[PDB]
Amino acid sequence: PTSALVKETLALLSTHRTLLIANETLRIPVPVHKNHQLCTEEIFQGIGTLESQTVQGGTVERLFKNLSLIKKYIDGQKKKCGEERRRVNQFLDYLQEFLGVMNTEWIIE
Amino acid sequence: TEIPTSALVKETLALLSTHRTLLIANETLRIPVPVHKNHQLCTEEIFQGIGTLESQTVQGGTVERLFKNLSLIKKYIDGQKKKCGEERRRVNQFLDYLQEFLGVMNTEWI
Amino acid sequence: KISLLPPVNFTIKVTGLAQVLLQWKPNPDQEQRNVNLEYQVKINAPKEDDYETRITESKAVTILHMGFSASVRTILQNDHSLLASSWASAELHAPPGSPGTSIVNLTCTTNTTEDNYSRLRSYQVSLHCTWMVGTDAPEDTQYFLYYRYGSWTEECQEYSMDTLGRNIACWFPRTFILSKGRDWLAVLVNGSSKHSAIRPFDQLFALHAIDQINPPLNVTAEIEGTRMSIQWEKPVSAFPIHCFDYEVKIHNTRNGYLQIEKLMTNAFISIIDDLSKYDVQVRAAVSSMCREAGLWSEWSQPIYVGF
Ligand SMILES: OC[C@H]1O[C@@H](O)[C@H](O)[C@@H](O)[C@@H]1O
Ligand SMILES: OC[C@H]1O[C@@H](O)[C@H](O)[C@@H](O)[C@@H]1O
Ligand SMILES: OC[C@H]1O[C@@H](O)[C@H](O)[C@@H](O)[C@@H]1O
Numbered sequence: 188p189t190s191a192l193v194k195e196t197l198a199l200l201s202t203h204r205t206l207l208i209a210n211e212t213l214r215i216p217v218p219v220h221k222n223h224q225l226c227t228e229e230i231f232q233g234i235g236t237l238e239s240q241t242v243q244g245g246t247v248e249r250l251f252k253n254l255s256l257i258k259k260y261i262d263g264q265k266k267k268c269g270e271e272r273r274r275v276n277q278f279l280d281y282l283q284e285f286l287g288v289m290n291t292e293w294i295i296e
Numbered sequence: 297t298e299i300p301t302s303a304l305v306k307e308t309l310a311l312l313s314t315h316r317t318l319l320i321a322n323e324t325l326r327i328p329v330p331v332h333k334n335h336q337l338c339t340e341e342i343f344q345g346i347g348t349l350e351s352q353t354v355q356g357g358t359v360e361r362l363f364k365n366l367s368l369i370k371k372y373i374d375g376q377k378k379k380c381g382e383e384r385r386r387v388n389q390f391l392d393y394l395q396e397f398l399g400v401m402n403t404e405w406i
Numbered sequence: 407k408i409s410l411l412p413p414v415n416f417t418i419k420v421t422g423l424a425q426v427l428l429q430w431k432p433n434p435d436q437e438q439r440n441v442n443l444e445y446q447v448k449i450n451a452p453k454e455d456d457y458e459t460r461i462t463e464s465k466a467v468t469i470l471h472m473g474f475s476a477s478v479r480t481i482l483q484n485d486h487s488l489l490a491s492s493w494a495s496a497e498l499h500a501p502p503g504s505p506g507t508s509i510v511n512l513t514c515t516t517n518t519t520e521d522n523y524s525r526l527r528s529y530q531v532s533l534h535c536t537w538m539v540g541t542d543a544p545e546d547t548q549y550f551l552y553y554r555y556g557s558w559t560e561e562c563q564e565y566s567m568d569t570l571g572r573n574i575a576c577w578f579p580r581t582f583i584l585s586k587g588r589d590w591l592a593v594l595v596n597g598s599s600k601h602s603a604i605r606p607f608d609q610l611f612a613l614h615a616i617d618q619i620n621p622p623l624n625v626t627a628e629i630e631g632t633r634m635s636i637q638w639e640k641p642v643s644a645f646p647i648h649c650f651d652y653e654v655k656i657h658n659t660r661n662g663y664l665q666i667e668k669l670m671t672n673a674f675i676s677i678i679d680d681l682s683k684y685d686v687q688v689r690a691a692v693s694s695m696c697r698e699a700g701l702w703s704e705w706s707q708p709i710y711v712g713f
Contacts, residue, residue, distance in 0.1 A: 193695070194693075200391070200398075207387060208386075208387045210387060211387075213386075214384035214385060214457065214458050215384055215385065216381035216384055217383060217385045217389055217393050218379060218393065219379050220376060220379055221396070222376065223401075224336035224397075224401075225336050225376055225377055225380060226377070226380035226381075229381040230393070230394060234394070264332060265337055265338075267330060267331050267332055268328070268338035269328040269338075269344075270328070271329060272328055273327060273329040275319060275320045275322065276316075278327040278328075278345050279319065279320075282312065282342065282345075283309060283312055285338075286305055286308060289335070290302050290306065294557060295299060295300070295302070295556075295557055296299055382459055382461055383458070384458040386457065389457075400586075403696040403697070
């Protein structure tokens, strides 16, 4: 899959910063809280708009591809949520896992 | 929206453990369950299943308070998604966020 | 042809350490809503920003001891046109107090340790701040430190005083600060005295900038004929194994010869000579790939191999 990807697309992000941050009139959705994973739909539509806005010459083209593979991975993880039907006692365990976690390690406004 | 206190979450957990036996009582029921542990991706399905337990069970007693609690946690979670895109900010600031995301994706999954 | 009017009842209110809430209300006299209006917010001081928002409220994390000032304006975008109104404005004044009454040089430092109980591996975060008293402070003045992380605010319990009363340091062996945390730490330092008001002072720290990473433990070197096997353990921290950068430093005490290797694994095989005593140390930092660049740890204690 996609371990290799991210680490590389990070430094790619780093080196193409000044170029990306040059349209100062442009505004993109950015969540106001830090449960990033609730927000992938937005995070990805911002990249889309960024991408349509930025000139497709150079190694920059590669940064976007990479982001699109990460997009694919995430889409797949998401389809795995509702893939496999199971007995109720199973689903309850999940729920309580989900609730413990929502409790020990999310900020809560 | 209602900040779902960590006693409430904690109360709900207790209420859940109690009604377990009542809740399983439908051998015919199957409920989508995620194979991985990234809950934040699956909030949709989580509430969907809750939804079907609810639509089946009789409300009354502390059993109602259960679904009332879950309901209130669900609204909170929607509060939080709307919060994903109500402010548009400079690219500079979106880049920072994208970066965090990638880093936490890297440090939490595998 | 629509004619946009500024929002009204624009107010700023302090809701916690280095935190505020801007609110306003749509203009009662606006050409009736069948179109969705939005807002543009511009933070003017101490630190510039603007951004657009879609509801009528906005949180802002910001330093307050310099006073804060903001403006908001209404906008309407569509097919063929943008339109934006004149601005509303508001501000908080800087808190009362003489200039040198205020704390100076505040530094803060985080460090992680392991709860050696609880049956389940979670971790603990301490915080340690120092500052100096500032030149105009009256002799009787006392300073107090508060911190905030996400929704939790605490006041300091155990200080360290200069040789005539005044708090100059603070220590929290535990806190509500998440280790792998990605949010701001906010610190406030108040004061008081018989002979006048004291200027508060606050600041925002990023965790990666102040987290004192722990050295690797258990560095072992096995010398075998001509090869040296060095080995070490991941530092005490809540970032997993695959999140660390190391530097391993091999130093020949016989002639000075020096070798340093940067790497992300936990072991290293270096060719060596058989007539020297070497000392070897290891240093650690968390990978820019897991969090933004932060601090290096101290080097582990010298261990020695060879004669
Ligand atoms: O508003 C909450 C307040 O809590 C108090 O304990 C602090 O002294 C104030 O500085 C803070 O603003
Ligand atoms: O000095 C800051 C000024 O900047 C601009 O946004 C506007 O002209 C004013 O409403 C604001 O006070
Ligand atoms: O006394 C103040 C504190 O200073 C810190 O440097 C140490 O880590 C603590 O163990 C000590 O208690």
